[PDB]
Structure 1
Amino acid sequence: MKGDTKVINYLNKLLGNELVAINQYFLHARMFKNWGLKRLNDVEFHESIDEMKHADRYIERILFLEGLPNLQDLGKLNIGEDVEEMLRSDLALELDGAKNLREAIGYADSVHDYVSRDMMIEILRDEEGHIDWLETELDLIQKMGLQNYLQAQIREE
């Protein structure tokens, strides 16, 4: 069913955001795993899977609307070298992605693609959940100190 060209361009942009996040979350998870921070490996791995599911939704929607999903152009990763830097980078990526989602959701409504909008609002809800988790972890590092925080990650939850 032929979709709106600009909506498709938005969906590809958002798909691009998800592709960056899949890779960044996955590498972060395995860095945490290497360091023995099992709890962080578990959550970050889950977050990577969440972004994979989002990517899947975008790919399927773009194809339905007769566009071409772009999985070729990968945007900049920002890995970081310690736990705080890594979590802050993930948070910054989530916030940038949320800005893009808000713009796309408004545009989709303007051209009456209400199903694409519905899909995007559900994805935005998930992303705000990730933002909540990341913000909370970063605040916990400050409150209990890094040494206690790291100790709290070595066992699975």
Structure 2
Amino acid sequence: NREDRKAKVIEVLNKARAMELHAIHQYMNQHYSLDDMDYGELAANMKLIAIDEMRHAENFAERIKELGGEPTTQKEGKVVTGQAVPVIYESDADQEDATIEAYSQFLKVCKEQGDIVTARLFERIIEEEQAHLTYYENIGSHIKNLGDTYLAKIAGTPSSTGTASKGFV
């Protein structure tokens, strides 16, 4: 059953990939809103987390290619726009939490299909999702508990995420 094992892993890898593509767009939308509001540090860290999901999306596609499949290019679920700051961190924490639940199941399938390399990929990525979760939880906890005295400190901070995107041009 070589082919069935391959096919079954590719299916969860494409499920996870589509979840990554949704998070990229969702986090970046919130990044545009945070920058607009001039809350630099929140905006910078939101983009940096979106870049992590980009890297997750890339790794899932590379493994899908190694297994003979085709990486999906459609995002899972819909992006929510116009979210308020308190809503941003509460939904993002919920979404990371849900992501770690789904990936843990995906991990299950990989082990069931005797795929150690893909299982380890999900294991590695779950640890990074956990860092995202803690991040969004903490911010959400400060927002709830301290409100505007917390935000006054973020106002006007730098939004820079480092040297610009090394690209082609």
Which contiguous aligned blocks of 4+ residues in structure 1 show a shift greater than 4 angstroms?
A: none
2:37 aligned with 1:31: no
- TM-score, normalising length from structure 1? 0.93
Distance (Å, rounded) in 2 between the aligned partners of 1:47 and 1:68: 25
Per the TM alignment, residue 73 of structure 1 is displaced from its structure 2 partner at its CA by 4.7
Distance (Å, rounded) in 1 between the aligned partners of 2:92 and 2:55: 17
Per the TM alignment, residue 80 of structure 1 is displaced from its structure 2 partner at its CA by 4.7
One of 112, 120, 133 as aligned partner of 1:131: 133
Counterpart in the other structure of 1:5? 7
- The worse-fitting range, judged by mean Cα deviation, of 80-89 and 130-139 is 80-89
Aligned residues of 1:80 and 1:89 also touching (Cα < 8 A)? no
What runs of 5+ residues in structure 2 fail to find an aligned partner?
160-169
Distance (Å, rounded) in 2 between the aligned partners of 1:53 and 1:99: 20
Counterpart in the other structure of 2:167? none
Counterpart in the other structure of 1:97? 99
Counterpart in the other structure of 2:70? 68
- TM-score, normalising length from structure 2? 0.86
- The worse-fitting range, judged by mean Cα deviation, of 147-156 and 58-67 is 147-156
Distance (Å, rounded) in 2 between the aligned partners of 1:74 and 1:111: 24
Size of the aligned set, in residue pairs, is: 156
Per the TM alignment, residue 69 of structure 1 is displaced from its structure 2 partner at its CA by 1.0
Counterpart in the other structure of 1:147? 148
One of 54, 57, 67 as aligned partner of 1:55: 57
Distance (Å, rounded) in 2 between the aligned partners of 1:102 and 1:72: 22
- The worse-fitting range, judged by mean Cα deviation, of 147-156 and 109-118 is 147-156
Residues 28-65 of structure 1: CA deviation (Å, up to 9, x unaligned): 11110000000111100100000000000001110110
- The worse-fitting range, judged by mean Cα deviation, of 55-64 and 73-82 is 73-82
Aligned residues of 1:78 and 1:89 also touching (Cα < 8 A)? no
- The worse-fitting range, judged by mean Cα deviation, of 43-52 and 84-93 is 84-93
What runs of 5+ residues in structure 1 fail to find an aligned partner?
none
* RMSD between aligned residues: 1.7
**SS at 2:22's partner residue?**
helix
Using the aligned pairs only, state the percent identity.
27
**SS at 1:4's partner residue?**
helix
Q: Which one-letter code corresponds to 1:125 in the other structure? A: E
Distance (Å, rounded) in 2 between the aligned partners of 1:123 and 1:81: 27
Aligned residues of 1:79 and 1:86 also touching (Cα < 8 A)? no
Distance (Å, rounded) in 1 between the aligned partners of 2:82 and 2:150: 18
**SS at 2:77's partner residue?**
coil
1:99-118 equivalences under 5 Å are 99-118=101-120
Aligned residues of 2:8 and 2:113 also touching (Cα < 8 A)? no
Per the TM alignment, residue 97 of structure 1 is displaced from its structure 2 partner at its CA by 1.2
